[PDB]
């Protein structure tokens, strides 16, 4: 360069071709590391935890805690807001922590005409294109909403234009963990979902979270040939610097926006079973099998909360609640796309303005995975109705855990051991879930001088069933025993 294409003033006139050229040269001369700019990491924690047991009202839980790491690399960004005027196709966003935190900084400057393509089953190749003179949230939304009307009446009457369903499920352990899985924008929906994390950590409940995305249509932007093509000539280099744009804080443009319906489902249960994964997964498909008790027990102690974005009327977020029957219809609500369904942004993708390279975000965190094993409390019932004097010898161990996680077995005994008991005698011995090595011996006095005692019942390591009833009866010479187990 030199004199030509330059004013004699040495200045670059606002609203001229030279200004747009200076801007174009300014963006192209930017040097930055793509990956470092879009990298964020959450909590970092040590990897040594203790084994612990806690006594619940009706259960003894053994809790194992282990460090796990979550890492995701994706170019798609989930939307959890509805009144967001920043998230329109073609919008220029600033690359900083606000972008990673899913609270973007919008570069609102005089914009040049931009062309948009929209994918729809009925729209012909030629009719899909769309030109907006001054791309803003109102402008692009108008042109899209206008085009939907023409398509709906023309072709959109064929009903089976099914939404694209997408499933994302994950076990909940921490907020940081969920942000990595669902994006940093999840914290808004996570606050309305009421995720109880302490109870998961204490082994009280197990929580699973499900995504549901149904995409009606997506609006796209063609590749930007020159970085300056996006601005009007009124936009000047000193204007971009005034707004803090540089190689350290470069520019990105929303290249695609997904429009449709989105549901966030939360399933927390007090069940400690390890078929919880199978119960929730079977539930989502609505295929409740015919057994009466095996899965219904956990489900009836499972209660559900949901958050709905999109669907019928354009009003933003709907929080719904119930148990299980309604889950099947939530998926069914947005199955069909109508013009009655406006559809709203649920996901968008960004590309760097300088070279149209799609921006990928690297997110990671350490989280404490919680594993739980429960042991139900039980009862030991004794009934003596025999024609003799009987003696009981009932012993067991109580499992406890050390400060360093060692197993501790504390010997226990019925306080009535060895005592002469006579009919009719009954008692109930409450046994907590941490009871191990339960042994029950029963002897009876025969009254015979040469063999005073007769063993009547002797068992070791008796399983801790819900209700066990040992009943003895009969006579000195012919004692009778019954061991009845009630478990369900």
Author numbering: -16 to 471
Text taken from the publication that reported this structure:
Gram-positive bacteria, including the common wound-infecting Staphylococcus aureus, the virulent food-borne pathogen Listeria monocytogenes, and Streptococcus pneumoniae that causes pneumonia, utilize cholesterol-dependent cytolysins (CDCs) to attack and kill mammalian and human cells. The bacteria produce and release CDCs as water-soluble monomers that attach to cholesterol-containing cell membranes, where they assemble into large, 200–500 Å cytolytic pores. X-ray structures of pneumolysin (PLY) from S. pneumoniae show that the soluble toxin monomers are roughly rod-shaped and consist of four domains (D1-D4). Sequence comparison suggests that all CDCs have the same domain structure and therefore insert into target membranes in essentially the same way.
To understand the functional role of individual sidechains in oligomerization, prepore and pore formation, we mutated Asp168 that, as the structure suggests, might be involved in forming a salt bridge between adjacent subunits to alanine (PLYD168A). X-ray data were collected to 2.45 and 2.5 Å resolution from crystals of PLYD168A and PLYΔ146/147. Superposition of both structures on PLYWT showed no significant overall differences, although a detailed comparison indicated small changes in domain D2, helix bundle HB2 and in two of the D4 loops. Around the mutated residue in PLYD168A differences were restricted to sidechain orientations, while the deletion of two residues in PLYΔ146/147 caused significant conformational changes in the loop connecting helix α5 to strand β7 of the central β-sheet. (B) In the pore complex, Asp168 near the end of one long trans-membrane β-hairpin (HP1) forms a salt bridge with Lys271 in the other trans-membrane β-hairpin (HP2) of the adjacent monomer. Like PLYWT, PLYD168A bound to cholesterol-containing liposomes and oligomerized into rings. However, unlike PLYWT that lysed the liposomes within a short time, liposomes incubated with PLYD168A remained intact for hours. This is also reflected by the hemolytic activity, which was reduced by 80% compared to PLYWT, highlighting the important role of Asp168 in ionic interactions between β-strands that stabilize the pore complex. The detachment of PLYD168A rings indicates that the mutant does not insert into the membrane as easily as PLYWT to form pores.
